[PDB]
Amino acid sequence: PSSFLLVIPGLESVHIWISIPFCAMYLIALLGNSTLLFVIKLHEPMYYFLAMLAATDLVLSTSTIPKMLAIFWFNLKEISFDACLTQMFFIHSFTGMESGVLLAMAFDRYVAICYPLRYTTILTNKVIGKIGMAVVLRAVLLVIPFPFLLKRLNIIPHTYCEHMGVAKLIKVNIIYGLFVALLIVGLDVILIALSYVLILRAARRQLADLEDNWETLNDNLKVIEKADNAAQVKDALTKMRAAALDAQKATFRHGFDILVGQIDDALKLANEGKVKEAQAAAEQLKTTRNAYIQKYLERARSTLLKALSTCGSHICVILAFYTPAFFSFLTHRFGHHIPPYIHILLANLYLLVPPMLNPIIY
């Protein structure tokens, strides 16, 4: 054929009033993405992925709104076949890229949290570029067969060319449509969950190690205070020196050196077979312990947590982009009693509101 006659079919009476929210959302998304890209023109990998996400999102949003606005206002409902194929390919490819970018952001957050000292040496401009190129190539390759398969084989009740909607004009295309969903979207869920469980599993042992060190130094010291033999004092002081060394390594800096020096001075006296002097030195060390042990451990608990609050903003994007997808999937498989115009409005909203929400969050 030459042209397709697009048509909200139920609400065909009033159409001007429906276009106000869509125009407002498009303007907001365009302005937000433009500002986000302009502000960078912060050289960190996470910001690079955020910029790529914003650019892909803006280009996706600009590829669907104008046709709907023109249909609503000017009532020009004719689309060339080439335009329909182009719009289909662009929409699907950009959704895939957005998912890939989210996955890359999750990986960057994981490598930041679990390895804070090797974050720069692992992520290099070359490796980041290779990852981005791989994501783009995977999305393009997986989205390339759709136009060819459709071209292998005149009213659309919609506002843009959707592959599932166009295919109704059967039992084979749906298999590939389901396979691609579980390769660029289904795998993203699994990888993000695995990258979040590993992050949350990390905070648990780093804090546990410091807690263990504090408990063992305190507990052991009580034993030294209640000490009765030349051997026991030495056996406890050696463990004290080891624990202090490890705790200072794990990192209020000098204070660890002072505690270590006090432990060393106590060890020498016990080496010379004096019990009272060792007990006195141990009691003296408790002063520096209370002076620096109390303050370091107080900040230690608050310290581990701050790194988990940098990952909080990235959870909102997932919640705002995946949950609408799940709602759309549920309404596209069990939504029979609802009239079709509700289906059209819901699909438009689920496709359009992530572009609105993303720039406002970041």
Numbering used by the authors: 11 to 17, 19 to 52, 57 to 168, 174 to 189, 194 to 226, 996 to 1044, 1061 to 1113, 237 to 294
Text of the article:
Olfaction, or the sense of smell, is initiated by the stimulation of odorant receptors (ORs) by odorants. Here, we determined the cryo-electron microscopy structures of consensus OR52 (OR52cs), a representative of the OR52 family, in the ligand-free (apo) and octanoate-bound states. Several subtypes of the human OR52 family, including OR52A5, OR52B2, OR52E1, OR52E8, and OR52L1, are known to recognize carboxylic acids, and the consensus OR52 (OR52cs), representing 26 members of the human OR52 family, is also responsive to carboxylic acid odorants.
To understand the mechanism by which a fatty acid odorant with a long hydrocarbon tail reaches the ligand-binding pocket, we aimed to determine the structure of OR52cs in the apo state, without a bound ligand. The four-helical bundle fusion partner of thermostabilized apocytochrome b562 (bRIL) was inserted into ICL3 of OR52cs (OR52cs-bRIL). This chimeric protein, which showed neither basal activity nor OCA-induced activity, was purified in complex with a Fab recognizing bRIL for the cryo-EM study. To date, only a few class A GPCR structures have been reported in the apo state, such as structures of rhodopsin and constitutively active GPR52, likely due to the structural flexibility of class A GPCRs in the absence of ligand. With a large dataset, extensive 3D classification, and local refinement of the receptor, we successfully obtained a cryo-EM map at approximately 4 Å for model building of the apo state OR52cs. The apo structure of OR52cs reveals a large opening between transmembrane helices (TMs) 5 and 6. Indeed, the distance between L2025.40 and L2626.56 reaches 14 Å in the apo state of OR52cs, compared to 6–7 Å in most class A GPCRs. In the apo state, the extracellular segment of TM6 (residues 255-266) makes only a few contacts with TM7 residues, whereas the intracellular segment of TM6 (residues 237-254) forms close contacts with residues on TM5. C2436.37 and H2466.40 form close contacts with Y2205.58, and I2506.44 interacts with I2165.54. In the middle of TM6, Y2546.48 forms hydrogen bonds with S1143.40. All-atom MD simulations of the apo state OR52cs showed considerable fluctuations in the distance between TM5 and TM6, whereas the distance between these helices remained stable in the active state.
